[PDB]
Amino acid sequence: STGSATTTPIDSLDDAYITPVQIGTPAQTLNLDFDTGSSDLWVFSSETTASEVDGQTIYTPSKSTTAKLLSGATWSISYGDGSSSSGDVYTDTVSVGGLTVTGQAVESAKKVSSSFTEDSTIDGLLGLAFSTLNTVSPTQQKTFFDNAKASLDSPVFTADLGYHAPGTYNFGFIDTTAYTGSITYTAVSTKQGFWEWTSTGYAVGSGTFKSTSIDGIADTGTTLLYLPATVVSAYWAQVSGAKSSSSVGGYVFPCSATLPSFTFGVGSARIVIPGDYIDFGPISTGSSSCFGGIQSSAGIGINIFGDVALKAAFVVFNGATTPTLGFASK
């Protein structure tokens, strides 16, 4: 089997992407944030504290003939940005882009933190990291990808995120028309439960390539590119007037600037992030200070190849017995 679904930016900055997901019988379609940095499929629901729901579409298990309470199971998750959610668990039928899993753990939110409430466009998350990070207790549950894997034509999914435009998540096949040149594959460590890999270096603009190992995670659920302070300083030093602002919470730059590209290495191959992808606009409405898309990972504890980086590539998440990651230009 295979599946193919379009993923759409939630706003003009590509702050996140939402993908429609069918849950239950008859289908209830919710727009979920596919997140390769976590492993829970959780939704706003009829059980969510009413004061914490503001415009989201909810899953109502009582209206699904295939929903079953997973008795005694609870979940609770905290994300790298300080947001969180928790609740109980149902199993139900879940379909993405024509690919159907029966018995999928659908984690129903009883509580969500303010950032989730305030984002009317995201109805929940669909985790695509390794199932070892799933938070369901006392019986850990599998991700949608892990459940689908054995049925898939090939045990892979691909992320093809757009810049200010829709893109595609495919399950079970590699669309050879969706990228240019060849896909370069690189080793993955699953030791922390992430799609963790080592970039071979970077370049700023038309500068020379610096060969250096950068361990990090491919994370579709993180907006920006978080890299070591040395790398990030070298990038922003090429933008007149750019500076790190503790009050704003990262590097800002004059909105009048033209940003240089940023290149990252995948083995001997190179992925080029155009300068425009690094512009996240005014720090507040009407400001001439703009927020940078490349930020320091210092104090996160891990480097994160988030959407800024991934949207410059066609990315293969290969879930074979020994997982790997592939990157192609597009």
Side-chain angles (χ1 to χ4, degrees), residues 173-190 192-198:
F173 73 103
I174 288 157
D175 183 352
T176 62
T177 73
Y179 59 87
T180 63
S182 54
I183 307 177
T184 297
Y185 289 86
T186 196
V188 163
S189 171
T190 63
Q192 296 184 47
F194 298 121
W195 294 91
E196 187 170 1
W197 65 289
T198 302

Side-chain angles (χ1 to χ4, degrees), residues 95-109 112-116:
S95 301
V96 177
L99 171 65
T100 301
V101 168
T102 58
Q104 174 64 47
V106 176
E107 302 172 35
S108 169
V112 303
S113 64
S114 58
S115 57
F116 285 116

Side-chain angles (χ1 to χ4, degrees), residues 249-275:
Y251 279 92
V252 297
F253 67 94
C255 292
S256 60
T258 297
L259 296 177
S261 63
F262 183 90
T263 301
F264 65 93
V266 182
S268 59
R270 306 289 180 252
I271 299 298
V272 179
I273 306 171

Side-chain angles (χ1 to χ4, degrees), residues 192-242 244-307:
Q192 296 184 47
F194 298 121
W195 294 91
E196 187 170 1
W197 65 289
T198 302
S199 171
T200 48
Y202 70 98
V204 177
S206 59
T208 60
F209 185 87
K210 176 74 169 181
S211 291
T212 186
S213 293
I214 305 167
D215 295 341
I217 67 167
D219 185 1
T220 59
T222 292
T223 311
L224 306 184
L225 177 50
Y226 295 88
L227 290 173
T230 46
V231 178
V232 175
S233 181
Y235 178 81
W236 289 108
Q238 297 304 309
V239 178
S240 188
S244 181
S245 169
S246 56
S247 60
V248 178
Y251 279 92
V252 297
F253 67 94
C255 292
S256 60
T258 297
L259 296 177
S261 63
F262 183 90
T263 301
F264 65 93
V266 182
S268 59
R270 306 289 180 252
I271 299 298
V272 179
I273 306 171
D276 292 339
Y277 290 25
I278 298 163
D279 176 14
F280 279 75
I283 59 172
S284 295
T285 302
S287 177
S288 73
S289 182
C290 273
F291 198 67
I294 296 178
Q295 297 294 345
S296 177
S297 65
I300 292 177
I302 196 157
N303 300 307
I304 307 176
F305 293 87
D307 299 335

Side-chain angles (χ1 to χ4, degrees), residues 32-42 75-81 83-85 104 107 116 122 124-136 140-141 143-146 157 169 192-196 217-222 304 317:
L32 305 186
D33 184 351
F34 282 24
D35 178 15
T36 63
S38 68
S39 306
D40 286 50
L41 192 175
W42 75 259
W75 64 278
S76 179
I77 193 163
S78 302
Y79 296 101
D81 68 342
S83 68
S84 64
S85 51
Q104 174 64 47
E107 302 172 35
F116 285 116
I122 290 176
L125 265 64
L126 192 149
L128 292 168
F130 293 88
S131 293
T132 53
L133 295 180
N134 176 266
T135 76
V136 178
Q140 187 171 62
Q141 299 296 302
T143 68
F144 174 81
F145 179 52
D146 264 4
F157 68 90
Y169 281 103
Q192 296 184 47
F194 298 121
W195 294 91
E196 187 170 1
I217 67 167
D219 185 1
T220 59
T222 292
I304 307 176
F317 294 79

